[PDB]
Amino acid sequence: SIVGEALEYVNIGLSHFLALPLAQRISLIIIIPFIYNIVWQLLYSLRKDRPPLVFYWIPWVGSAVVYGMKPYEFFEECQKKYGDIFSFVLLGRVMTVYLGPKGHEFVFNAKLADVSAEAAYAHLTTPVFGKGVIYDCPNSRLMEQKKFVKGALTKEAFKSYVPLIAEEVYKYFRDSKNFRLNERTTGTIDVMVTQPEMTIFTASRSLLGKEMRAKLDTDFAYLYSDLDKGFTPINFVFPNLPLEHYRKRDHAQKAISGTYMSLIKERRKNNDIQDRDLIDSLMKNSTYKDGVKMTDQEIANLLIGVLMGGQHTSAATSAWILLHLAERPDVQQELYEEQMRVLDGGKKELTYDLLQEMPLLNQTIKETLRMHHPLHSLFRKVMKDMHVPNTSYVIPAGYHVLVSPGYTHLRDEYFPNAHQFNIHRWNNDSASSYSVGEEVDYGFGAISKGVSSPYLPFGGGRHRCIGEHFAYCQLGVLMSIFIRTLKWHYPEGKTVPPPDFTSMVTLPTGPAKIIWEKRNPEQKIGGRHH
């Protein structure tokens, strides 16, 4: 009755393990975790309190490749096999996806104690934006940061932003190599070159002021290119690697925030604090409710985050608008007629109020944002075990939840013919969004309490967008002028490109080219240029 004889051979076996040839040990350090991975999934599948987990061969990596390249196609397949709730492994993390409006509710309206946005996001935003703001702070501070920024995002602010944005668009048609409307009546542009440039010029001039705008006319502009380099999700896998690239990022953040603090410290020194910018605004209004004031460094880091977030979502969207309208001359024609009616043949100057009377223009943005949500996935880290109601499921702390209103945007059940671009699906519903009923305030204004709308381009709950009206104002001025000034179409055989999902935002796969021509070949844009 000796099991001792077996316990010796355990020890013996361990000793022989340490004496295998390296060719068999390396092999083992590969085969052991691979074998163990597969048996763990097999066993995991039996738990009834866990959503189905998507099968994967490579440990740690998980479904990263397929998710990273075609997330919506990944979601549709998983949805057919497993339904609306499923998990998948992603570079070391377990992601629990909840699709559809009930997913929007589950994730966007999760209790503050259940999930953390900053725990999912901080490890990219912080190196790009700087410390102490956005996701490098507790949620309550973020809530008030959004409140501060919203104080420069009023109707009265938009009324003064409109002519500023319009002047920038005209200067851009006049001076940019991509246009030069005074010298060329037709031409070809890559919209992934023009829109990011037009977006930074207009957003700077209005949110940052003329000083910062003027900086863009110099080599300073390169720093923004550098800073944006660090805003690619190789940095979620690798937040800090001691290579180059990471260093222009860090350098840019320091140099750009330095430029903002310089301006800030000079205004306060010269008593020059008015009501022009987001900068004036945060200088007058950045004291938290417990009495602590934001530092000049935190104010500048917040400016970087706000400008950069708004940079990428808006430029991607005007790119898609131009790309969809280029094969839809009927929509351009219709948008033009609206321009002629609202602006009295173009003899009325565009104002923020006149923008609100251009429903087809706004529906075109609304529709573009339906087909091309610039953020295909929003994440939280689960902080406390979460029960999914009317199910047996429990999402344990340490998991991540993934919500994807952009996927619902593309479902026929909610938007008939969802892959067809049609601005008329929004007739007499041209509002950028609308609180479908009751409201709640998390610290930056009252917003819809329910988040079950299948159309959720600006998310919802405490992390909801506050840039929506600014985006519509900027995209609206932009497109109003494009429409009244140019017609445009594709080179022969070209069509709307597929999205490049691997980036920060769901940009079109470049180069995405369109051919423009002046509606009025003789029209000249005034003002001086080199």
* Binding-site positions for heme: 465
Alpha-carbon gap, residue 28 to 130, rounded angstroms: 43
Contact present, 168 and 201 (Cβ < 8 Å): yes
Alpha carbon distance 205, 208 (integer Å):
6
Binding-site annotation, residues for heme b: 121, 135, 146, 380, 463, 465
- Asked whether the beta carbons of 239 and 123 are under 8 A apart, the reply is yes
Q: How far is the CB of 91 from ligand TBQ (least distance, A)?
A: 13
In whole angstroms, the minimum distance from the beta carbon of 310 to ligand TBQ comes to 6
Is residue 458 close enough to count as binding ligand HEM by CB under 6 A?
A: yes
Instruction: Figure out which of the listed residues 103, 305, 457, 508 binds ligand TBQ, where binding follows CB under 6 A.
Output: 305
User: Can residue 187 be called a binding residue for ligand HEM (CB under 6 A)?
Assistant: no
Q: Say if residue 354 is exposed, middle or buried (CB neighbours under 10 Å; 0-12, 13-18, 19+).
A: middle
Give, as one character, the DSSP assignment of residue 88. E
| Closest by CA position to 433, among listed 452, 412, 455, 410 | 455
* C-beta closer to ligand HEM: residue 118 or 226: 118
Q: Confirm or reject binding of residue 313 to ligand TBQ (CB under 6 A).
A: yes
Partner from ligand TBQ, ligand HEM, none binding residue 63, C-beta < 5-8 Å depending on class: none
Decide if residue 504 touches ligand TBQ (CB under 6 A): yes
CB of 53 or CB of 153, closer to ligand HEM: 153
Position 70, amino acid:
K
Residues 6+ apart with CB under 8 A from 271: none
- When asked if residue 62 is in the footprint of ligand TBQ (CB under 6 A), the reply is no
Determine, following the binding rule CB under 6 A, whether residue 187 of this chain makes contact with ligand TBQ.
no
Q: How far apart are CA 49 and CA 10, in angstroms?
A: 36
Neighbours of 357 (CB within 10 A): 13
Identity of residue 67: Y
Pick what 146 binds: ligand TBQ, ligand HEM, none; C-beta below 5 to 8 Å, kind-dependent: ligand HEM
Cβ proximity to ligand TBQ: between 359 and 476 the closer is 476
Number of residues that bind ligand TBQ (CB under 6 A): 14
Q: Which helix (H) or strand (E) holds 513?
A: strand 513-518
Q: Which is nearer to ligand TBQ, 233 or 511 (CB)?
A: 233
Q: For residues 132 and 301, is the Cβ–Cβ distance under 8 A?
A: yes
Q: Which residues are annotated as a binding site?
A: 121, 135, 146, 380, 463, 465
The residue type found at 84 is D
Shorter beta-carbon distance to ligand HEM: residue 194 or 313: 313
- Identify which range of 92-100, 161-169, 347-355, 452-460 contacts ligand HEM by CB under 6 A: 452-460
C-beta of residue 282 within 8 angstroms of C-beta of residue 330: no
Report if residue 507 touches ligand TBQ, rule: CB under 6 A.
no
| Residue 444, both tokens | 């930056």
Closer CB to ligand TBQ, 450 or 467, in the complex:
467
Among 191, 319, 410, 465, binds ligand TBQ (CB under 6 A): 465
* Residue 363 binds ligand TBQ, judged by CB under 6 A: no
Q: Please tell me whether residue 134 binds ligand TBQ under the rule CB under 6 A.
A: yes
The entry of ligand HEM, ligand TBQ, none that residue 117 binds, CB within 5 to 8 Å by partner kind: ligand HEM
Long-range contacts of 55-60 (CB under 8 A, 24+ apart): 56/88, 56/89, 58/34, 59/33, 59/34, 60/89, 60/91, 60/92
Q: What SS3 class is residue 290? A: coil
Residue 149 contacts residue 208 (beta carbons within 8 Å): no
309 near ligand TBQ (CB under 6 A): yes
Chain mean position to CA 177: 28
Q: Which of 67, 72, 121, 444 binds ligand TBQ (CB under 6 A)?
A: 121
The single residue among 87, 204, 286, 313 that binds ligand HEM, judged by CB under 6 A, is 313
What are the residues binding ligand TBQ (CB under 6 A)?
121, 125, 134, 233, 305, 308-310, 313, 375, 378, 465, 467, 504
